[PDB]
């Protein structure tokens with residue numbers, strides 16, 4: 001086992017993200033460009049108009065019920081330490097509207113967690129069965145911001161012709177025109193987070209410096225206390241596995257695994273009779 | 274006010290008034306980065322970024338971004354080299370998200386933000402101004418001219434040009450700090466200036482949209498008012514409404530200076 005890179009983010013995050021390999025001879029991944037914030041190749045025509053921001057008139061730290069930005073998700077879901085409240089809906093999370101440059105409040109108000117970046121210590125590591133993965137190097141309480149799903153913002157039409165969908169994330173569940181983040185060519189640490197059938201982080205859609213609802217940003221928060229050494233993972237979703245399961249099956253090893261060869265076979269044999 | 278920037282800069286920018294009873298200004302919105310109010314089609318395509326292949330601190334002459342800048346003009350402490358053309362500054366291309374270097378390389382001064390202590394204050398004759406609260410060595414990055422990116426056509430429609438900065442394209446775009454701006458909107462004209470504007474590219478390289486960075490052109494002492502040369506064009510427009518009050522012996526735009534040149538004719 002060897003530390004093969006001290007910081008895959010090259011200093012772009014608040015904290016380093018080392019890479020270790022104790023499984024094989026694979027060097028730290030080079031077949032992508034690490035970026036800390038979303039990029040575009042062809043333009044997405046994002047509405048950046050500062051006058052199109054809903055914003056608040058608070059002169060405190062935006063902890064009162066009078067903060068419009070909080071009201072845009074019924075309430076601000078962050079406590080004084082930046083963690084999601086206990087009663088936050090982790091099954092169907094609301095859209096979060098953080099404070100922004102139009103708000104009268106200060107940059108250090110309580111409604112600005114995701115825009116402040118990575119704070120926890122993570123490690124890129126070689127897994128036994130799933131390629132690279134990401135694990136915690138510290139205790140992470142439930143409700144803590146982990147990292148953003150960062151990559152190249154692309155259209156539905158462009159996503160459809162991309163050869164590799166292994167790093168592709170669509171931004172809404174609906175049937176219409178849905179934009180995507182493709183982390184294949186450009187991405188951050190999130191591109192390495194694997195699927196777990198017993199996940200410990202959840203994606204939350206967030207708005208910060210724009211409120212172009214076509215382009216929510218994807219923030220991962222812990223859904224339970226996470227222990228040092230624990231692999232991070234979220235539920236990729238059934239749609240992902242419907243596509244992929246003819247190529248590989250889930251190796252998460254959970255007793256609750258929904259997408260292993262065994263689980264899939266038990267499903268099909270249920271119908272084979 | 275302890276900080277007109279509301280915590281958005283690396284350091285506070287306090288405001289004081291020891292001249293009259295005017296409250297610190299509130300007839301604008303402080304923003305720390307440029308904004309837009311109608312679509313500005315800036316080319317942000319990451320594949321269009323020229324970028325370097327350095328793994329050093331980008332002080333090497335092999336750094337492409339340095340070469341794009343003619344050379345990297347930053348010394349080890351982030352200050353412009355003496356050889357920098359302060360009369361007609363070049364374009365600076367800082368490193369960006371496409372470069373292979375680390376975020377702490379030597380070619381990222383402007384994108385790292387304000388480091389010096391400044392103060393918004395009431396001047397005797399020129400309204401509000403900005404002054405240093407520390408010694409500032411020559412070549413030091415001070416602040417960016419931040420405001421609302423607008424087209425020249427939009428600029429022509431607007432009533433007030435007192436906070437309008439022409440990016441000098443030859444289609445034309447401007448930064449209007451009238452409604453949205455940062456501390457730079459308060460920096461006055463001086464005929465004996467101590468800072469200079471420099472065109473800089475950082476996260477995009479759309480040459481239609483340079484960002485404007487101010488650097489000190491000489492050592493500045495604590496308490497000294499900051500100022501740059503607004504340019505003859507500004508004064509050709511404005512001299513019919515007011516004249517220069519900078520009070521320098523080399524003042525070019527005072528009523529007296531103007532009258533002398535006119536009577537000469």
Ligand SMILES: CCCC[C@H](NC(=O)c1[nH]c2c(c1C)C(=O)CC(C)(C)C2)C(=O)NCc1ccc(CN(C)C)cc1
Pocket residue numbers: 156159160165166167168169170171172173178180203205235236237239240
């Ligand atoms: C590799 C990233 C995880 C796996 C990933 N998951 C999600 O996109 C997703 N979207 C939402 C979630 C997740 C997990 C949520 O949980 C909720 C959400 C509202 C954020 C909406 C996926 O399924 N990738 C295949 C793929 C994506 C997109 C296309 C392009 N078009 C055909 C749609 C093709 C293939």
Ligand SMILES: CCCC[C@H](NC(=O)c1[nH]c2c(c1C)C(=O)CC(C)(C)C2)C(=O)NCc1ccc(CN(C)C)cc1
Pocket residue numbers: 425428429434435436437438439440441445447470471472502503504506507510
């Ligand atoms: C209040 C800001 C200082 C004064 C200001 N100075 C500059 O714009 C300027 N531009 C460059 C400089 C300066 C000082 C430089 O030094 C060099 C540069 C290449 C950065 C190009 C000005 O002249 N404002 C009147 C004004 C601007 C724009 C319009 C709209 N269109 C007719 C263009 C009308 C009136």
Ligand SMILES: Nc1ncnc2c1ncn2[C@@H]1O[C@H](C[C@@H](N)CC[C@H](N)C(=O)O)[C@@H](O)[C@H]1O
Pocket residue numbers: 129130131132133166167191192193194195196248249250251252
């Ligand atoms: N639960 C899983 N079981 C098997 N393979 C997985 C699982 N989760 C992620 N993967 C693999 O990881 C890919 C998704 C990537 N976004 C994650 C990083 C990937 N492990 C890598 O090494 O680059 C999938 O297409 C699979 O190849």
Ligand SMILES: Nc1ncnc2c1ncn2[C@@H]1O[C@H](C[C@@H](N)CC[C@H](N)C(=O)O)[C@@H](O)[C@H]1O
Pocket residue numbers: 398399400401402435436458459460461462463515516517518519
């Ligand atoms: N040298 C000067 N002489 C007279 N007035 C000046 C001078 N420099 C700047 N000004 C004034 O300041 C305006 C430019 C502003 N960007 C500077 C801040 C301005 N002093 C204010 O109080 O808002 C000009 O239109 C003038 O009203």
Ligand SMILES: [Zn+2]
Pocket residue numbers: 056057058061062066067068069070099103105
């Ligand atoms: Zn608020």
Ligand SMILES: [Zn+2]
Pocket residue numbers: 056058061062099100103105106109110111
């Ligand atoms: Zn706020």
Ligand SMILES: [Zn+2]
Pocket residue numbers: 055056057062067068069098099100103104105111
């Ligand atoms: Zn707000």
Ligand SMILES: [Zn+2]
Pocket residue numbers: 196197198250251252253254256257258259260
């Ligand atoms: Zn599983």
Ligand SMILES: [Zn+2]
Pocket residue numbers: 325326327330331336337338339368372374
């Ligand atoms: Zn370089």
Ligand SMILES: [Zn+2]
Pocket residue numbers: 325327330331368369372374375378379380
């Ligand atoms: Zn560099």
Ligand SMILES: [Zn+2]
Pocket residue numbers: 324325326331336337338367368369372373374380
């Ligand atoms: Zn570079």
Ligand SMILES: [Zn+2]
Pocket residue numbers: 463464465517518519520521523524525526527
């Ligand atoms: Zn003068």
